[PDB]
Structure formats: C-alpha cells, structure tokens
Amino acid sequence: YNCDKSVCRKCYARLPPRATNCRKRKCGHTNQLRPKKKLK
Amino acid sequence: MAKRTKKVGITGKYGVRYGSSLRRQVKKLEIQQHARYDCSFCGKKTVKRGAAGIWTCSCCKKTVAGGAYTVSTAAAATVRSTIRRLREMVEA
Amino acid sequence: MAAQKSFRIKQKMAKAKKQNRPLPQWIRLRTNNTIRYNAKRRNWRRTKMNI
Amino acid sequence: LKAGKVAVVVRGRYAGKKVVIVKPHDEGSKSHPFGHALVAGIERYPLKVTKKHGAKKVAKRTKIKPFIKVVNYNHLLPTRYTLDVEAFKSVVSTE
C-alpha cells in the first residue's frame, strides 16, 4: 500500500510525499504533486 | 411493484437461463436474508447479514449466530424447545 | 540506491573493468615474445562481462 | 487560555469512546500513524482503558463501563444476598 515519492504534474520530478510541494526549477509551491499509485 | 412481471428478486443477475427451480432456491434464502428482521434484544428491524452465519444488529451491535442464509430456521427453533423440555422436567 | 547495490558485488564488477584495460607500452618493449594482443579485452556491445 | 487536544471518536471497533487529555507532548493526541500524545481518563469509576491518538482511534465506553461494573456489582449484591437468604432458609429449616 501507500507512501512512495510524489511525482510533479508540471516538471515531472519526484519529490517526497512529506514535502507538500514541487520543484524542479521555480516550480516553487505549484503543489503539483501526485504520489505514485503504489506500484504494479 | 418494480417494472417486473413475476418475481426475480435476484434473478436479473442470471440473465435468462438457469431455470425455474434452480433460481427459486437461490432466490428464497438470500431474499429472506435481506428481509428486515427484528433483533431479539432491541426489537428494531435492524438485523443484516455480516457474512454467512454472522448476523449483526445495526442499532445494538450485538452479533449473533444463526443460519447462513437466514437469521434463524425452524430446525434451530426445534432444538431449543426440546432441550428446554428436558431441562424443565429435571428441574421440577 | 540503485543499482545493483550489493557492496561486495559492486566491487567485483568495478575491479574487473580496470583489469580489462590496455597494456603498458613497455612490456612490448622489454619484451618477452608476443605480437602482444592482451586478449582479455572486454567489449562494448559484444561478449558479456561474465555470468 | 488555549485550544486543544484528547480523542473521542467513533464506532468502528470495540464500543467507545470517551477518554480525557493529560495535555499535548509533541502535538495533541490527534489521530495519525504513530501515537505521540496522550489520553487518560480520570481514573477510577468510568474505568477507561482508553485511546490516545495521534492514532485513529478506540476506547471502551465511559457510561457503559461503570454501568457494566455497577450493574455487575448490583447483580452480585443481589445474587449474593439471594445465596445468603437461600443459605439462611436451608440451614434453618428442618434439623
């Protein structure tokens, strides 16, 4: 089941679930994170 | 009723086939399991089937044994009366 | 992590890469005998580092 | 002069639930994974076996536990008193 790392919906860079927010470069609280649907 | 003619209950699941006799049994036990039953304790029409042979009361939360399909049967009721008849005589 | 992380394994695969290197000019020069084609040579696409 | 934090809850579970806040250590006693913070309930006759939280969450029931013990005691005092009356009648009766 759950927590992986969270994958940016804009940049597509994987940042933590424990981080609220995303960045690859100035994404900076774009919040644009989906956690991984925990595998297959 | 429903937009139904006779009485499916469950039957729609089957689709068409299965036959009158076979589908009737499978209708009777399950539709009677679904039927609102009074709990002995509260008296509200609570009882639902938790699992096969598990019955639970929504209001009281007392859970009880019974038939798989129905909360109770005739058979179980017969057993309880005879033990009680034996028990009564012994006690006096 | 990754890959393949095991510390012991990693070293063997690393160790092997250096071992598969070209000769030093000198051994051809002080010389034994040998049109010195190393041989051990291991290869980009081809062969396999060893199973 | 502040806000904050115990549990009560819910009713999956096991009966509950009422318990009381000794305070908050590192957070309140506030549903999660790992329980950090604190429950009691003040101790002797609701008899609460409890739940802390930080951890999402179960007590056995506060009125019902004093009633189970008080009614148990109440059952006992009468069963014992009946056994005591029963014992009086049987010893006393013939010879």
Partner: protein, 254 residues
Amino acid sequence: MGRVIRNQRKGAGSIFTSHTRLRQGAAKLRTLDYAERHGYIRGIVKQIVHDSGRGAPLAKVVFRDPYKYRLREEIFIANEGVHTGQFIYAGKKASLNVGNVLPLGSVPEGTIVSNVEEKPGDRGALARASGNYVIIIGHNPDENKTRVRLPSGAKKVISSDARGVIGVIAGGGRVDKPLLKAGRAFHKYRLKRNSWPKTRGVAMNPVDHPHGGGNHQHIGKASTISRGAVSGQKAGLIAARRTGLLRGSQKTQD
C-alpha cells in the same frame, strides 16, 4: 504405463494442501480445571467471526478465570442461537443451555449435542460440520456407556466422560442452495485442501487415467473395483457393491 494420475498427485506437494495460514485455527473444546458448579468457566461471546476452514462461524469467547496455570480462551465453535453477550460455561456443573459444554453423562437424554469427544480430553471429535448434529439417545445413569447417534445415522458407543456442546452448529442449510457458478465455487476451493477445476478421467488420454482413451469418450472397462488395488489402479467406483441408484437402504452394521 502411465504418467502419474491425479489421485497419486494429491500425495503431497504444495498444489494439494490448503493455505493453512489463512485458517484461524482449531477451536477444540478446552479441558476443565474442575467443577464448573456454575462460572469458573464464565465466557461472554464478544464477537462472531467466519472460519474459512469449515465455512461456518466461530464465536470469540473470553474467559478470565485464574491461576498460573489458568488456561483460557479462544475461538470455540459457534452453535445456532449463540450470540454476543450470552454466557458460556464449559464443564460438568454447567447449566443445560445451548452453547454450554459439558460431559455426555451430565447431558439429559434426547438433546441435540454437537462437538462430542471420541475419547476424553481429545477435545471434541464429533458432528462437526455446519448444521450437523449428534443426538444422544441413551444414557440412563450409565457409568459404562453413552450411546450417541451421529449425523450419518450410525450409533456410536462412546464413554460418558466425553464432552460435547449442546445445540447444532451454526450455518446450517448451507448445502441447500447450489453454487450456480464456476466462479463462486472457485474462491471456495482456494480455502480447502483441493486442486480444482477437475477434468473427467474419460475426457483424458489413457496415459493420464484408466478411464481415458478411445475416440468416443467412454470408460473402457467397468468401474466397480477390487479393494486390494493400488493407488493408480483404483479410480471410479471404489469397492462398491451395488450401483445405480434406486433401492437399498439399510444401516449395515457389524
């Protein structure tokens, strides 16, 4: 000769066993400290939870009685009409209420019992499955014997010291409705000590079964078999006697 035949494959091997670890357990009947003149075994059912191991319900009972050794708990067998908040007493001077466990000697004649010991302390051998039941026909004060009628209808003579639980086991009338689907039957098979789906022997090749071979499907030979026969030789109707369907009877009886 053959390839190994299915029966021989049961044998042992992982494909044959049940997934024993998904089973909650046994639920054998405990072994009295002593007495039990009412409530030195006192249980309350707090829950009813399904056993995948017999497709019938168990009752979780606890049991609180003392010492060091004390023994207590667990999942004893549920009967019909047994419920959460109802009391269980297990032993000799227990009341004759459904769900209470006692030796057959203490039980009144003509009361349905389930879960009866073959031998004392073996914890409950008999009648057993969902909605099955023993009837204790006879006692008297018998020091010597208690005569019990099994669910098969055989009369067994068992010792009066054998415990049993009063009532029939819950979930009866489970056989009554048919599964109706392969899919329903499947999930049920995963629970038990079984390989299925099962292909017919006649459907098979001669190498796979004695019943196999032939253009058209047929048992080449008869079925009714010689009891001496090896595992591989014995398929079909084992040591039958008569076949079809439509007569007989009787309790036979030695």
